[PDB]
């Protein structure tokens, strides 16, 4: 009999039952999408577009709804901080309910295809047996995919009929959904350019339409049909799985490294932005400008937006969480309340020392106050006996500008040490940890969870493609050898 891992092999030869189980899986996926969206709207707190955005709340499909245009909600609010006067029918809950009713209709269609499986459409009239013209089915599917891709690229993202996509400034401060003009030049192949998406989708849709028309028109050859077994369903299964984990690897890399399709204000910042000093660079540039024309360091730090200083915090690092540190970042290190201001450290003779920011690989880092010249001047010494760079010996005082603490100078070592420890993580923020009872360890971004899950699934589907391709080529010897 069929083993437990071979049960679905009952529907290899049945196209009607195959369509039924495809519809059942598709209904399950649509129902999950709707249920996940309702769950995330139920547990979603829109009470801070800036300091507690969706990626700080561990929202998974909320950025994907947001990226393609769904920004308003039936709850009477907008994620950008505005008020939804009339969100219409296409809100978050609207899309979820549409997915739920789609799942129900697909479940009914799956039941119908399970019952009425014996359709002569699945039987070729030349011999009466049940067979599928897989090259022609592929041509139809490729033609349909070309039309859908070209329509999505020429009507939705371009805004001539649709709403466009999520476009923002390079540092992810404002963010919105705009129609985007296609970039047909080499800059269209710029990954962070939003204009590549409409141009790519238009060109790929047109070429897919042409390839589908060609596949509808022209039959395969003897050599190709007997080599790749185009009359077999495991062959197309193997190759489809190959394309699927190819796309999974590509999109996992895109999510991890960042692109125009992965906005930072939706999926969190990237680890390379923290590693390469992106937000710290922009903050210090926006300080150097407007300190070069008056309004000195005592002021003008308020000209630094709180969102940028939040982006300059390693707690928003996607590669700083854990495998089993479950939940949102808010459940990890509290909810951000406000910016405490930039901490400037000075010794007794007046040199400006700065903390050595902890890298991504380290979870516990030694605190070192190092000067402009790059010479280690102070630290929180582990020894504290025959120690040469301790806080009270160097005489380090910490000051704050532009935050809740402004013009406040702290001199005592017990307070200077803890503010230096807070500054070791980047910009210093205060966190309410009593609302969700946070444990104190950093969590992972939705971007990080997406990339981890998709890479694991990509390797698993590499194995699946190997197994199915082996079964494809070696179908006749699957029960043993010929012994002759």
């Amino acid at each position: 009999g069929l083993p437990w891992y071979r049960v679905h092999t009952v529907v290899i030869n049945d196209p009607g039952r195959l369509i039924s189980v495809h519809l059942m899986h598709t209904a399950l996926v649509a129902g999950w999408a709707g249920a996940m969206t309702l769950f995330e709207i139920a547990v979603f707190d829109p009470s801070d577009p800036v300091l507690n955005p969706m990626w700080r709340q561990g929202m998974f499909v909320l950025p994907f709804l947001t990226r393609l245009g769904v920004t308003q909600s039936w709850g009477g609010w907008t994620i950008s901080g505005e008020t939804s006067s009339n969100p219409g029918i296409w809100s978050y809950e609207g899309a979820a309910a549409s997915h739920i009713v789609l799942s129900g209709l697909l479940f009914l269609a799956s039941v119908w295809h399970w019952v009425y499986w014996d359709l002569e459409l699945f039987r070729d009239p030349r011999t009466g047996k049940t067979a599928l013209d897989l090259p022609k089915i592929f041509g139809i599917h490729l033609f349909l995919a070309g039309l859908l891709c070209f329509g999505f690229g020429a009507f939705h993202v371009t805004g001539v009929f649709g709403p466009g996509i999520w476009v923002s400034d390079p540092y992810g401060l404002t963010g919105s959904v705009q129609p985007v003009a296609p970039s047909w030049g080499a800059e269209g192949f710029d990954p962070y350019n939003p204009g590549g998406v409409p141009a790519h989708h238009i060109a790929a849709g047109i070429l897919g339409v042409l390839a589908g028309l060609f596949h509808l028109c022209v039959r395969p050859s003897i050599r190709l049909y007997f080599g790749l077994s185009m009359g077999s369903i495991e062959s197309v299964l193997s190759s489809s799985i190959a394309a699927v984990f190819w796309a999974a690897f590509v999109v996992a890399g895109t999510m991890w490294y960042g692109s125009a399709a992965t906005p930072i204000e939706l999926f969190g910042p990237t680890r390379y932005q923290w590693d390469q000093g992106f937000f710290q660079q922009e903050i210090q540039k926006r300080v150097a400008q407007s300190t070069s024309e008056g309004l000195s360091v005592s002021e003008a730090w308020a000209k630094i937006p709180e969102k940028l200083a939040f982006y300059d915090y390693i707690g928003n690092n996607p590669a700083k969480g854990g495998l089993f540190r479950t939940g949102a970042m808010n459940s990890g290190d509290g909810i951000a309340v406000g910016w405490l201001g930039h901490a400037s450290f000075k010794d007794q003779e007046g040199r400006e020392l700065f903390v050595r920011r902890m890298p991504t690989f380290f979870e516990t880092f030694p605190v070192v106050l190092i000067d402009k010249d790059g010479v280690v001047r102070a630290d929180v010494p582990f020894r504290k006996a025959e120690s040469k760079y301790s806080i009270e010996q160097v005489g380090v005082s910490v000051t704050f500008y532009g935050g809740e603490l402004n013009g406040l100078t702290f001199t005592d070592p017990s307070t200077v040490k803890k503010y230096a420890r807070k500054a070791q993580l980047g910009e210093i923020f205060e966190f309410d940890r009593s609302t969700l009872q946070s444990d104190g360890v950093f969590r992972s971004s939705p971007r990080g969870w997406f990339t981890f899950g998709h890479l694991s699934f990509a390797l698993l589907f590499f194995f699946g493609h190997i197994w199915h391709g082996s079964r494809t080529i070696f179908r006749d010897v699957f029960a043993g050898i010929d012994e002759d």
Partner: peptide, 27 residues
């Protein structure tokens, strides 16, 4: 104003900064 100041400002906090890793053959 000048970029040499922010270079020395970013040098001690994070040595992996992209402006420091670009065009630094003169340094």
């Amino acid at each position: 104003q000048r970029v040499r100041t922010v270079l020395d400002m970013d040098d001690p906090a994070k040595e992996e900064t992209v402006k420091e890793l670009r065009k630094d053959i003169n340094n």
